[PDB]
Amino acid sequence: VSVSCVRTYRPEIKKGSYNNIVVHVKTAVADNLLFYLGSAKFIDFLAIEMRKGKVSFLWDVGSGVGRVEYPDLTIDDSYWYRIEASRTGRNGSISVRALDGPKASMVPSTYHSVSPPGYTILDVDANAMLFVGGLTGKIKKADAVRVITFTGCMGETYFDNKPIFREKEGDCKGCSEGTIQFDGEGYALVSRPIRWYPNISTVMFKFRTFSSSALLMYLATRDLKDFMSVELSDGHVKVSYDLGSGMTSVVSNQNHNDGKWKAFTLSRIQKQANISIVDIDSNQEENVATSSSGNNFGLDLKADDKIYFGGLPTLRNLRPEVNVKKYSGCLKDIEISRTPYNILSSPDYVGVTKGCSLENVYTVSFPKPGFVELAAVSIDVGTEINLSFSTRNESGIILLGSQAYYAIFLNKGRLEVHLSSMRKIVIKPEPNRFHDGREHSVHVERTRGIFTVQIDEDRRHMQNLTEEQPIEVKKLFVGGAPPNIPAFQGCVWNLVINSIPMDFAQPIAFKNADIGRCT
Ligand SMILES: *[C@@H]1O[C@H](CO)[C@@H](O)[C@H](O)[C@H]1NC(C)=O
Ligand SMILES: *[C@@H]1O[C@H](CO)[C@@H](O)[C@H](O)[C@H]1NC(C)=O
Ligand SMILES: *[C@@H]1O[C@H](CO)[C@@H](O)[C@H](O)[C@H]1NC(C)=O
Ligand SMILES: *[C@@H]1O[C@H](CO)[C@@H](O)[C@H](O)[C@H]1NC(C)=O
Ligand SMILES: [Ca+2]
Ligand SMILES: [Ca+2]
Ligand SMILES: [Ca+2]
């Protein structure tokens, strides 16, 4: 990038019969001198310029001027363009490619023209001069060139298939995948795209989750007559919509909450709709189609109606057939009505984190004081408990069941373990703390008349428990639980009780649980 100032260079011509010049330009001015090559001894010259917004390549190899203009485009709208011209004897070509903008999707063509018959070599003396974006008074421009200034910014210049200041006159100077993760406590909105066309819908976004019941997307009119939703149902992707004449809904044959990225695509044309789910790695694709009932053809979403993702806020009204359960999982490449959206650019979303981190369903982590409720499990004679944790908060409950109860918890550095129906063990760390942010594995085994605990293979403590009746509880928790000791903060994983691995795929409840990884 270079604004304002003229940049002169001394070219190196390899083939006198061939020329190739590449320039990147960006301006709002209709007339400019983009490239120029000439010398003091010869009239010969090369030049790339614009007239009324059109790029023209002109030259004179000693027998008269040759000019070829690119008609397909006009480049004075401030987008970046790649202008490439070349010469073969008296034959010149011009080609323009827009790097961005509404023209960037065009297919760059190539027009040719020729200079008068005769000479064919680009003559130049020793002190040749190649100017970029303007002209220096050290050389007299060819009459054919009418404007010698340049208002804008120039890009990488290539001359004779090689990159390119001998003299710098003037004061020179330079010039949305949106991957997100929801953890069951957020939502996000997107205003309706102006490109929204009522009788044709187009929805795309990639998702990756372990959730079986969630809301992925929902939109509706103020009256609820017309709406559309995309949710997870038992792991399957389910689509529902009503255009005002009657609702319909399809559920995929396969479930897609395997932790892998999936590509979702909906295409509705009036009452008909094609849903497509693709496992991005294996490239396998599923296809399910459905049709709304009646005569209405449009999803008449209005100017002020919002489109939500991952969850919803509290709404006065809400379509009765949709599962609004907050979504836990990642999202990205959201596109609606041909319009891309980046939730992170949104100003009113809640409980969303940039990126994606989903490792397994046996790991959980708490950012803020939170908890995860698991199905009750009682400790009987012969029972074991194995888990791993890593917090930096001396005081925090790690495990807990519900008179009777059991618990593994850090206490001002100490790691208590309680059993009752009340005996308990308390290990004081030595040579290293527990809430030291690094891995730590606990082991607890209640046998006859005794119970044991052992952290990261050290002194397996012991304690009496002359009872045989199994200590049963009503609820089981990881991280903490609803009600006086501080909250737990770090992550717990690979929880095993009575030989059964305890996953967090779908907890009975939770609050501020970043299930799936150790943040
Ligand atoms: C100039 O070159 C192009 C391609 O190399 C060719 O299509 C065109 O006919 C040439 N001009 C003429 C007529 O010599
Ligand atoms: C659905 O897909 C079929 C091809 O599988 C196509 O012919 C039809 O036009 C599509 N209709 C839509 C986009 O609803
Ligand atoms: C969209 O569908 C409606 C029926 O719901 C129809 O009356 C209307 O003409 C369609 N829009 C157009 C003009 O394509
Ligand atoms: C727990 O640790 C976090 C940092 O991991 C800290 O911000 C917070 O204040 C701590 N909470 C308590 C109860 O000390
Ligand atoms: Ca010549
Ligand atoms: Ca309607
Ligand atoms: Ca309608």
Swiss-Prot record:
List of glycosylated residues: 91, 199, 274, 317, 386, 393, 464
Disulphide-bonded residues: 153-175, 330-356, 491-518
Every Laminin G-like domain range: 1-175, 179-356, 361-518
Localization, UniProt: Secreted, Extracellular space, Extracellular matrix, Basement membrane
Function recorded in the entry: Binding to cells via a high affinity receptor, laminin is thought to mediate the attachment, migration and organization of cells into tissues during embryonic development by interacting with other extracellular matrix components.
Subunit structure: Laminin is a complex glycoprotein, consisting of three different polypeptide chains (alpha, beta, gamma), which are bound to each other by disulfide bonds into a cross-shaped molecule comprising one long and three short arms with globules at each end. Alpha-2 is a subunit of laminin-2 (laminin-211 or merosin), laminin-4 (laminin-221 or S-merosin) and laminin-12 (laminin-213). Interacts with FBLN1, FBLN2 and NID2.
Domain notes: The alpha-helical domains I and II are thought to interact with other laminin chains to form a coiled coil structure. Domains VI, IV and G are globular.
Disease entry from the Swiss-Prot or TrEMBL record: Defects in Lama2 are a cause of murine muscular dystrophy (dy2J).
Protein name: Laminin subunit alpha-2
Annotated organism of origin: Mus musculus (Mouse)
Name of the encoding gene: Lama2
Stretch of the intact protein here: 2142 to 2707 of 3118
